[PDB]
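Limitations
The structure tokens in this dataset are predictions for the assembled complex, not deposited experimental models. Users should treat interface geometry with appropriate caution, especially where small molecules or nucleic acid strands are included. An illustrative entry is reproduced here so readers can see what is and is not provided.
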Amino acid sequence: VNFPNIPAEGVRFRLRARDSGYVIYSRTENDPLVWHYNGPPYDDQLFTLIHGTGSRLNLYAIKSVPNGRVLFSRNSASPTVGNIVGDGTYNDNWFQFIQDDNDANSFRIYSLASDSVLYSRTTGAPQFGNYTGPKFDDQLWHFEIV
Amino acid sequence: VNFPNIPAEGVRFRLRARDSGYVIYSRTENDPLVWHYNGPPYDDQLFTLIHGTGSRLNLYAIKSVPNGRVLFSRNSASPTVGNIVGDGTYNDNWFQFIQDDNDANSFRIYSLASDSVLYSRTTGAPQFGNYTGPKFDDQLWHFEIV
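Predicted assembly:
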């Protein structure tokens, strides 16, 4: 089932991993442009959601507040997770927020295009990325409303 | 994760529930036009999949062999599950086959449009339909290749 509390259009938030406590960022200078961060708030950690309609109903594009790029998550090229201009021009810009079956307070950030979920862990390279496979706790996220 | 063995285009199959053992049918005479059946093989239990591309990548339309209609699963009108002409002209004609997390040999027939899954049970009206909510064993299906 979809996560029951998905931010409305225009609502700003951070995406913080339940267990690592790190947040996603999306920036335009210095690789990796999309990764996780353990530290203080910076504006490149701020997102809003473009609410999908039509063929994108129940999917969302994750849009950077300061730079306007949207996230992508793919298996078709490297890097597998990154950002891009265009307000969701590509299929792999669209995400579903799926409630965890055993922890009602968290969700996975799921790509239908790549059948993958974003993860964040404090050890084990690569510490952030996407993943197609079994369910692990490092795949669980919160919306942190600002 | 998506069910690892999804029939290729042109491959005919029945959809049989793991536990009830009943099969889905899709017919053009006599309500309910889409429901489940406990009995012998009839052609209205035969389907192929239209493989989605683009915005429909990893989704499929479930197309009747004898009558060509595709299934729909929705929460916008009654009946919530039915069939329709058009080879997938509507968003609620598109389905994902999602492997069960605890039984690798079965999957749910999932609607992104309605955040619902098809179910079949031997008692409890309605015995067949779609459902948005917790995971139950009556939501688990097999492809039965013919």
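Some entries come with short summary sentences. For this one: Chain B touches chain A at residues 1-2, 54-59, 91, 96, 101, 112-113, 115, 132-135 (CB under 8 Å).
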